[PDB]
Nanobody
């Protein structure tokens, strides 16, 4: 209700390409609270991709994006970024950002009450 999230940066790319997604937060925000990216592929369920939380900005990454992803936050712009490199067709999905009133970055979608509408990433070969 009191925080809104808007994702951008999705597109159609070729296998191997990079994309930077952004999640812009507005409203009653607090930088240390967890911000997470999830993705949902066609015919599949939502799954954690990466997240950042805490006073020091500690990042966590899913096994699925090991060595291919970087998450960062810009407190001044109230924005969290996800850089994805070496994209593959299996990365095709709606990428959505989510937040919660805790610093803990968790992997279950069910524990985040606030979601953006998502941004689509489609990777062709």
């Amino acid at each position: 209700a009191e925080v809104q999230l808007v994702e951008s940066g999705g597109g159609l790319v070729q296998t191997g390409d990079s994309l930077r997604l952004s999640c812009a937060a507005s409203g009653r925000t607090y930088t240390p609270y967890a911000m997470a990216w999830f993705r949902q592929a066609p015919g599949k369920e939502r799954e954690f991709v990466a997240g950042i939380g805490g006073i020091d900005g500690t990042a966590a990454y899913a096994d699925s994006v090991r060595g291919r992803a970087t998450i960062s936050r810009d407190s001044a712009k109230k924005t969290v970024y996800l850089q994805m490199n070496s994209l593959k067709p299996e990365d095709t999905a709606v990428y959505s950002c989510a937040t919660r009133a805790s610093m803990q970055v968790l992997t279950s979608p069910r524990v985040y009450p606030i979601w953006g509408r998502g941004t689509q990433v489609t990777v062709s070969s």
